[PDB]
Nucleic acid binder design. Structure first.
Ligand SMILES: Nc1nc2c(ncn2[C@H]2C[C@H](O)[C@@H](COP(=O)(O)NP(=O)(O)OP(=O)(O)O)O2)c(=O)[nH]1
Ligand SMILES: [Mg+2]
Ligand SMILES: [Mg+2]
Length: 430
DNA sequence: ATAATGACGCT
DNA sequence: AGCGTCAT
């Protein structure tokens, strides 16, 4: 009864920018606003690979990782902006700084955890408490939740989206128990109000629009965020879960999108998140290991404990480049040359990092791919990073991989390299 | 010829 | 330490 722990202890939100790279490009170039458009890296191979798509472009079937030439076939009026190129490669600096604008704004409200270049989680538990004290005990008005959806409402005894949304919101507020300061749903509601505010501020001060999820944990906040994108936020209450999970494919839950999620489907013979409830913890631990079992057992009940880590800053800093097919690096002059290109970008990102964030990386990781290998990395090797010098860093990276050169000739490089990757890690205060 | 990255688990 | 998985 009262000792069944229910995962309602926290209030956690996930804010993710809408078609981010696109909005960055549209803020810069007014011509691209409210039009089908996409952002590509490179231009020579089939017009370039798409990495971001406005919603007007999505409505014609344009997706991430489509070639730009194929995309034009679906959507001939498609507008494109391409990623800056420096030192012979894609440079993402404009989106990193645009990201920092967003993160700095979110930081104002609460401690965030940077989960990607375009999203952060927030623990709103404390701020909800505060706002709750300050609102005395007066009703919460719909005018404070102008973009909020209540997952699973309306239900019970208009045909347009705004109509439906409001009915849902009304039902929820009409049944909200305001006098009870310890009510989880009331807390979510208040969290949701703050998130409206946070989103108003982001758009006011950056001109960028975003979606958000408000729930009791990260997994649910993330899932909820996706439900009503673009430019809308979504409250997933603890009670909405059984219905939500009842037809939620397992693959849609964070960290279940790959192999583990496949074996869950496969071993258990299920499709949806909620069918997990029929398994005892021990059983799921038997199949999926002890951590996964535990995590799965609670997750399918909407309970998840991972905390919102106070980390606004990346722990690693990295430059990488693929050299597909024919362009696979095949001489020792080439490998050196790109090591230097990568090294030089890395150097300028680190000097900026050290000035901005009062810290130095202490270690360099070197990673490569050989032709005829299947995985992201063929090989990783660490060395010291003692100076922010592109020559030393490039020289040293070379040093630690030269032995991988299987070639008999002096100058040649075999097998040819299909990837080079440098990553600075192990940071210490500066 | 998706491509550039970032986080984290396992051993 | 170096590899594997999952994500955006
Ligand atoms: N370079 C590179 N960037 C990528 C890749 N995948 C995503 N991004 C970049 C480009 C993305 O703009 C940014 C954030 O990605 P999301 O939030 O996953 N999708 P978005 O915000 O575009 O649209 P929405 O969220 O509304 O559906 O990360 C990639 O494979 N490579
Ligand atoms: Mg996004
Ligand atoms: Mg995202």
């Amino acid at each position: 009864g009262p000792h069944m722990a229910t995962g309602q202890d926290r209030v956690v939100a996930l804010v993710d920018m809408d078609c981010f790279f696109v909005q960055v490009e549209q803020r810069q170039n007014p011509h691209l606003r409210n039009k089908p458009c996409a952002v590509v890296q490179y231009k020579s191979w089939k017009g370039g690979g798409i990495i971001a798509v406005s919603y007007e472009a999505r409505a014609f079937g344009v997706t991430r990782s489509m070639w730009a030439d194929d995309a034009k076939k679906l959507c001939p009026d498609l507008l494109l902006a391409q990623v800056r190129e420096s030192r012979g490669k894609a440079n993402l600096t404009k989106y990193r700084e645009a990201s920092v604008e967003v993160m700095e704004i979110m930081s104002r409200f609460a401690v965030i955890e940077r989960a990607s270049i375009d999203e952060a989680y927030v623990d709103l538990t404390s701020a909800v408490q505060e706002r709750l004290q300050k609102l005395q005990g007066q009703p919460i008005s719909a005018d404070l939740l102008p973009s909020t959806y209540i997952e699973g409402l309306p239900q019970g005894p208009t045909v347009q989206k705004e109509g439906m949304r409001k009915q849902g919101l009304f039902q929820w507020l009409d049944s909200l128990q305001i006098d009870n300061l310890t009510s989880p749903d009331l807390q979510l509601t208040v969290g949701a109000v703050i998130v409206e505010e946070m989103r108003a501020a982001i758009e006011r001060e950056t001109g960028f629009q975003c979606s958000a999820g408000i729930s009791h944990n990260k997994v649910l906040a993330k899932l909820a965020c996706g439900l009503n994108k673009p430019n809308r936020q979504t409250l997933v209450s603890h009670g909405s879960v059984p219905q939500l999970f009842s037809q939620m494919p397992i693959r849609k839950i964070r960290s279940l999108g790959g192999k583990l999620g496949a074996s869950v489907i496969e071993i258990l013979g299920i499709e949806y998140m909620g069918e997990l409830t029929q398994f005892t913890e021990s059983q799921l631990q038997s199949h999926f290991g002890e951590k996964n079992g535990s995590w799965l057992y609670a997750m399918c009940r909407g309970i998840e404990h991972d905390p919102v880590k106070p980390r606004q800053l990346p722990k690693t800093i990295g430059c990488s480049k693929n050299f597909p097919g024919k362009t696979a690096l095949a001489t020792r002059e080439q490998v050196q040359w790109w090591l230097l290109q990568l090294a030089q970008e890395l150097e300028e990102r680190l000097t900026k990092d050290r000035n901005d964030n009062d810290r130095v990386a202490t270690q360099l990781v070197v990673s490569i791919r050989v032709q005829g290998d299947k995985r992201l990395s063929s090989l990783r090797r660490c060395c010291a990073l003692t100076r922010y010098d592109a020559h030393k860093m490039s020289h040293d990276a070379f040093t630690v991989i030269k032995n991988c050169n299987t070639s008999g000739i002096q100058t040649e490089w075999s097998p040819p390299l299909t990837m080079l990757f440098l990553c600075a890690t192990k940071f210490s205060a500066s």
